[PDB]
Ligand binder design. Sequence first.
Ligand code: XMM
Ligand code: XMM
Ligand code: XMM
Ligand code: XMM
Ligand code: CA
Ligand code: CA
Ligand code: CA
Ligand code: CA
Ligand code: MN
Ligand code: MN
Ligand code: MN
Ligand code: MN
Ligand code: MN
Ligand code: MN
Ligand code: MN
Ligand code: MN
Ligand code: MN
Ligand code: MN
Ligand code: MN
Ligand code: MN
Ligand code: MN
Ligand code: MN
Ligand code: MN
Ligand code: MN
Ligand code: MN
Ligand code: MN
Ligand code: MN
Ligand code: MN
Lengths: 234, 234, 234, 234
Amino acid sequence: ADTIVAVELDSYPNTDIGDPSYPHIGIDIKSIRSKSTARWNMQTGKVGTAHISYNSVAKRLSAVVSYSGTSSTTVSYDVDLNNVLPEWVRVGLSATTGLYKETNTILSWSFTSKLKTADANSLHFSFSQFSQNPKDLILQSDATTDSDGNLQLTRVSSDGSPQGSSVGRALFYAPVHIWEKSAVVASFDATFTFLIKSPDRDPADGITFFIANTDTSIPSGSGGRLLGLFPDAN
Amino acid sequence: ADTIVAVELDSYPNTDIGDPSYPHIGIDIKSIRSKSTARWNMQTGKVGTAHISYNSVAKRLSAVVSYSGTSSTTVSYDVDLNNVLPEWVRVGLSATTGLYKETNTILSWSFTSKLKTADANSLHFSFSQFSQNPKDLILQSDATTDSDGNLQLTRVSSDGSPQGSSVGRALFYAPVHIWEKSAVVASFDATFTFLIKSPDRDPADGITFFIANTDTSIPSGSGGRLLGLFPDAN
Amino acid sequence: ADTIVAVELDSYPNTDIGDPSYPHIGIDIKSIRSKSTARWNMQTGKVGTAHISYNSVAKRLSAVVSYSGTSSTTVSYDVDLNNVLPEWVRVGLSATTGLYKETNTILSWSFTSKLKTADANSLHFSFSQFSQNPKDLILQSDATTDSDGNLQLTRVSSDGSPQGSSVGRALFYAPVHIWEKSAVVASFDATFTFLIKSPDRDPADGITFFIANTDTSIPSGSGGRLLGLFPDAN
Amino acid sequence: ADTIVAVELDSYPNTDIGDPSYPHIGIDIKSIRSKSTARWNMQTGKVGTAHISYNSVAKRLSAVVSYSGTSSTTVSYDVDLNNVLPEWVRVGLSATTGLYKETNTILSWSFTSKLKTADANSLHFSFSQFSQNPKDLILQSDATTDSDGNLQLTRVSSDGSPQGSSVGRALFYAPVHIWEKSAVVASFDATFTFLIKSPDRDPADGITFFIANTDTSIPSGSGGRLLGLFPDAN
Ligand SMILES: OC[C@H]1O[C@H](Oc2c[nH]c3ccc(Br)c(Cl)c23)[C@@H](O)[C@@H](O)[C@@H]1O
Ligand SMILES: OC[C@H]1O[C@H](Oc2c[nH]c3ccc(Br)c(Cl)c23)[C@@H](O)[C@@H](O)[C@@H]1O
Ligand SMILES: OC[C@H]1O[C@H](Oc2c[nH]c3ccc(Br)c(Cl)c23)[C@@H](O)[C@@H](O)[C@@H]1O
Ligand SMILES: OC[C@H]1O[C@H](Oc2c[nH]c3ccc(Br)c(Cl)c23)[C@@H](O)[C@@H](O)[C@@H]1O
Ligand SMILES: [Ca+2]
Ligand SMILES: [Ca+2]
Ligand SMILES: [Ca+2]
Ligand SMILES: [Ca+2]
Ligand SMILES: [Mn+2]
Ligand SMILES: [Mn+2]
Ligand SMILES: [Mn+2]
Ligand SMILES: [Mn+2]
Ligand SMILES: [Mn+2]
Ligand SMILES: [Mn+2]
Ligand SMILES: [Mn+2]
Ligand SMILES: [Mn+2]
Ligand SMILES: [Mn+2]
Ligand SMILES: [Mn+2]
Ligand SMILES: [Mn+2]
Ligand SMILES: [Mn+2]
Ligand SMILES: [Mn+2]
Ligand SMILES: [Mn+2]
Ligand SMILES: [Mn+2]
Ligand SMILES: [Mn+2]
Ligand SMILES: [Mn+2]
Ligand SMILES: [Mn+2]
Ligand SMILES: [Mn+2]
Ligand SMILES: [Mn+2]
């Protein structure tokens, strides 16, 4: 099975599998059952931004979600990620819907990785718009780019109405070398902006930024509450 | 056949096929017969640096090669590259040896691409050292990374002595989107540092930075004087 | 007197002093009488973007202005800027109004300078919003930042209505080293976004990005058609 | 008195004032008596690198010092720096000698600051060499740049032999805005490389990277063990 590190924006509480009884952001280390969570004042219909960062000296994975003119939500987890992840990874965004649904629209995405052992090795990309058929993305499941240059991670109709029972992911094409033996320091930083809109009283299921082994794929039975990341709820 | 734009550092003059009677840097648009050339005061055995840049407004492809404490060599060619290249490309370094030989050692390589249609789309990578089996490079022909973390584009012995009759290329794994319809401006910048050492009175054949269609491969019969780039000398 | 290199967005034609009979973008080398001009399809009331770039190998100063969903305007001038400018400069934006007026609102500004003689020396800044009293800007004349986090280079009223007879400039606080002896290559890149709105049939006078000697100041009698840059019309 | 946050590379143990009985790296919050320390396997005569990073979500200030082919030294301190520092700061390097001495040579220095409230405000600079009279640095006390393009923070002779009883500091010219009200996330990153050589059995006194209020100056009586940062030993 895949090795996954993720920051989930979980719009739908599945208390059955450990979710708190509210919308929340969480840090997932190798399991859908977050190591750390925080309550998320979800602003359905408004543009959000998520920012995630880590470095190997501090060993502290942190995430913040904010909307214009609102309180931010932060979560942090102390973890040595080079003991969790392989040296080469792909980074991606994932989203799902289930019985309940929402648009999982990514409007921009940027990522920087640095690895030092003069002078640091690095990878940086940014998308403020995604072309149709972006050749530097691996689109998995239902993921597509729409006519507006936005990434629709889950199925959306002609008008833009979200559909249930969907999974989609977008990975950056190039593997990233996130650690080496005798590296001095390695660090990464990711940001995305998202629009989550719904006709439903309870939107589902959420959006994640995740880091996995390079050949990662959507696991069988990972729909809905498993966010396209995990084959089970352990 | 591939679509190639290259800046060649041509160490060996093949007057037979248009080379001036001296070592030279050149700008190659779709043919080994450079559109523009300049005499290159080659410092065999010393670390060089090459820098290449372009933008779509200025439409002027420029390259400079320098060594510590020596005169630089510049070449420029006025060309609209978005009329030459496809929209998605891979960028690479190539080198050859023939009957005469030299090490074609790349010590570092960095590249930035920006495409604007807020806010610009971009790709940047840098290597100050290359791991063995770098997963973000496509190594073609004889190309390998050595124990020192340097890229050896052509065959080199245990001690580091160069071998003749060799071809090698290294492409960055992710395609780069270098143009779009209604783009405002698109630009790129590449730098590499190289060590060319030889036991021969005349080193051969040279090193290139090149931009090609994404599935580019080493053409049959492109050895020696064709620098791993072209199937013929037209 | 100051040494000025500028890209002017000239909204008001002063044929008296060399302006074409239309709104235009121009490249000004040491005089308000542009070395190169292009007709500018001014979209009064809409957000514009301007991008300017140069490098010392290509020796070609280029600028492009665009609005969402419209044709871009480009201008270029072949010039060796290291023969014009001192080695240390300040970079700024300037604007004026005269008898006729317009808002000269800067919404964002970013700049990168690189100087290579391993590894390149560099300066980069970006503002997507400007605080009140920005300590890293030198504000000259009427220039101020407003409550929205935008830079108002010329006087604007409580409601936001533009005022005539105004001059204002904003310089980045730190001098930039744009050339050195035996530099391999030096390059810069600047972008800004602007909103020019007017109640007048003919807006005036325009907005510039400029590069000058470090202690540059607004010259006596440089109002209106002289864009805050030049003491005279020679 | 100044507000100081610093990472000290303390070569000389002053147990009198809290130093451990060995060379150490430390995190200084508003006092020479470090909040956090780690033993430093000082490699006198060899080129070191120091890297320092912080972000406002993680709230963890971290530093690592390394030499080629040796074990790194890391230190971290949990601290909300936006409760310590003003919003606008200058960043600098400082060094001292006392009765015992060492060269405090800075070979390169780079710094990135980002402040987000689209899209983040930022400042980045890098020096791989320092010109004589660098106009973007404020040199305080004995600090100068030498003929090799290196920064000598303390007095050095014609041949390069270090002198005792010296203080010197180098600040970047532009203030940096490291926090704002309702910022989402703010982060910084600094790296420098240093050469500490000595004819003495015990080198003294060390080198710091520090962040202070903008008009910071070398305090009276801050020589030797106070590293040019503090007026007293409290
Ligand atoms: O999209 C919201 C959720 O829908 C389903 O779980 C249910 C949530 N409320 C229900 C009510 C009835 C039934 Br049957 C089911 Cl499966 C559910 C499942 O698809 C979950 O994976 C998902 O988290
Ligand atoms: O490496 C130098 C050159 O060697 C060969 O061309 C020759 C250069 N001098 C010669 C002398 C004799 C013969 Br046969 C040949 Cl093929 C050559 C060929 O391999 C060329 O492609 C290459 O440029
Ligand atoms: O703002 C537009 C222009 O206004 C003035 O020039 C005039 C343009 N039309 C006029 C009509 C009458 C008189 Br008087 C004047 Cl000065 C002008 C001057 O202030 C010019 O510097 C400026 O370019
Ligand atoms: O440079 C090393 C140290 O030298 C001095 O302190 C002493 C260290 N060993 C000593 C021995 C004798 C005397 Br007197 C003094 Cl002041 C010292 C002082 O200058 C200290 O500030 C500094 O840390
Ligand atoms: Ca859930
Ligand atoms: Ca040749
Ligand atoms: Ca005019
Ligand atoms: Ca000490
Ligand atoms: Mn959850
Ligand atoms: Mn980089
Ligand atoms: Mn694209
Ligand atoms: Mn960050
Ligand atoms: Mn409900
Ligand atoms: Mn040639
Ligand atoms: Mn970028
Ligand atoms: Mn690597
Ligand atoms: Mn460049
Ligand atoms: Mn010969
Ligand atoms: Mn004009
Ligand atoms: Mn830089
Ligand atoms: Mn600010
Ligand atoms: Mn550009
Ligand atoms: Mn008119
Ligand atoms: Mn100490
Ligand atoms: Mn930036
Ligand atoms: Mn300089
Ligand atoms: Mn870092
Ligand atoms: Mn001792």
